[PDB]
Amino acid sequence: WKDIFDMFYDSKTYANCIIPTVINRLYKVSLALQKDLENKREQEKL
Numbered sequence: 712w713k714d715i716f717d718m719f720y721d722s723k724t725y726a727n728c729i730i731p732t733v734i735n736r737l738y739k740v741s742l743a744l745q746k747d748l749e750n751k752r753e754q755e756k757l
Contacts, residue, residue, distance in 0.1 A: 716725065
């Protein structure tokens, strides 16, 4: 798979191209899901 990437979808620019892609998810589906849920957790008791 690394060769799959690096053949021509390579240089990490393609990765850095895709890096934007689902950076939404980290808060679109992950950090909105959690730190809003952990702003509960972390402040749930203490």
